[PDB]
């Protein structure tokens, strides 16, 4: 058998038949495994929800480092005021990253010279197409495109490599026009 059945009747929690009527049912049933579907009164919904003993012992559940009373400041587990800013990049802020570079790969002059170099781009001093044409191969092939020269693809956060299940594990047999992917 598989991890998903079939299972007999004496493990299903339904009200069945008893005696000769069970022998007759297993004779006259397309699938004797199957149940009437009526729940078993002693078990289902017993004890009633308004008489559960477990409500007197119940206590509000918690997790340890948040219920810790001593070294549990809120300003460390304040994840709302740590929210990530909505970054905005107009063509000005992108040409500066092109003509100049970035904190990881600087290409900028030191001192007030480089400061006014930033200032020339903050205003309309140099344009995006001008610095796209003034960009050496190492700039584009490594900061706009890839090192291989190919453009990047629409990224996936959590990639999914699909797989097919066929034959016996599958939900439906081979003949049917539906299949099963893991």
């Amino acid at each position: 058998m598989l991890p998903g059945g079939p299972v007999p009747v004496f493990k299903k929690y339904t009200v069945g038949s008893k005696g000769i009527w069970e022998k007759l049912r297993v004779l006259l049933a397309i699938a004797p495994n199957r149940s009437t579907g009526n729940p078993i009164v002693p078990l289902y919904r017993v004890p009633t929800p308004g008489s559960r003993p477990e409500a007197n012992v119940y206590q509000d559940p918690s997790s340890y480092p948040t219920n810790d009373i001593a070294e549990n400041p809120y300003w460390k587990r304040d994840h709302r005021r740590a929210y990530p800013q909505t970054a905005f990049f107009d063509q000005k802020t992108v040409t500066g990253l092109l003509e100049l570079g970035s904190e990881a790969t600087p290409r900028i002059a030191d001192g007030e010279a480089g400061t006014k170099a930033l200032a020339n781009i903050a205003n309309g001093g140099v344009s995006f197409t001008q610095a796209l044409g003034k960009s050496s191969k190492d700039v584009i092939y490594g900061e706009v495109l890839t090192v291989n020269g190919l453009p990047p693809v629409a990224p996936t956060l959590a990639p999914k490599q699909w797989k097919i299940i066929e034959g016996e594990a599958a939900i439906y047999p081979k003949g049917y026009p539906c299949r099963t992917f893991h």
């Binding site: 810790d68 009373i69 001593a70 070294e71």
Partner: protein, 244 residues
């Protein structure tokens, strides 16, 4: 100014200054009255040069400890506004500002308060908290409230009506005071409890185990399981400190 600080001054001026530098270590010069008190054989008040060792002061100018130097639980070398010291650190620590500061303490009015092993140090610290509660001017928030929380806690740790993690709660309660006040009394209300926790923790935990065995279990805040507000009062548990 302090009385002594001006009282000495005519003599320092008359007599040349340099000899005062000749007393004591480089930055802790001179003589300093010491009011010894407590469970000492011969309580006394004396004058000595600074940077004198604590042990010579305890043994010579007084009668030594009552019951012997190894019948020593701790010592408080500046009064209640200074954390207690343990026996290990009383063996070689000079009675100056600097070295006492180097063992996370300090010299106050140089009033030594000695405590044998026959005493309840926790009873001494809760008393200092009851004092500071009585002497808070009541102006700034942390002293007004924190002192009373500290009293309500120390009165429970005295009988064990607590959990172990309440001690780290208590350390945070002192840090809620140590720098957020106007005057220095808030720091003085914090420090001794920091010194008790730093050194004599197991006595607290042992009294707590003693409560858990002799009375019953306990939760945060001294609430037991049978505790309840019945008819205007809490009835299902002991209430430490309430005298009114």
């Amino acid at each position: 100014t302090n009385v002594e600080t001006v009282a000495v001054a005519p003599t320092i001026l008359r007599r040349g200054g340099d000899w005062f530098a000749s007393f004591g270590r480089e930055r802790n010069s001179g003589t300093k009255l010491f009011c010894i008190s407590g469970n000492v054989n011969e309580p006394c008040t004396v004058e000595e040069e600074m940077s004198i060792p604590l042990r010579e002061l305890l043994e010579k100018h007084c009668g030594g400890i009552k019951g012997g130097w190894d019948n020593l639980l701790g010592v408080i070398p500046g009064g209640c506004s200074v954390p207690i010291l343990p026996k290990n650190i009383c063996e070689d620590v000079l009675m100056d500002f600097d070295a006492l500061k180097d063992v996370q303490s300090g010299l106050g009015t140089a009033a030594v308060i000695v405590i044998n092993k026959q005493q309840d140090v926790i009873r001494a610290i809760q008393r200092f908290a009851a004092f500071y509660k009585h002497e808070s001017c009541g102006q700034c928030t942390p002293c007004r409230e924190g002192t009373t929380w500290l009293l309500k806690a120390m009165d429970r740790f005295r009988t064990g009506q607590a959990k172990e993690r309440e001690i780290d709660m208590l350390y945070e309660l002192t840090k809620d005071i140590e720098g957020h006040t106007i005057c220095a009394l808030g720091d003085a209300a914090a420090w001794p409890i920091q010194g008790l926790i730093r050194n004599f923790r197991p006595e607290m935990e042992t009294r707590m185990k003693k409560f858990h065995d002799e009375v019953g279990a306990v939760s945060v805040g001294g609430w037991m399981k049978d505790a309840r507000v019945e008819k205007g009062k809490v009835v299902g548990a002991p209430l430490p400190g309430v005298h009114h």
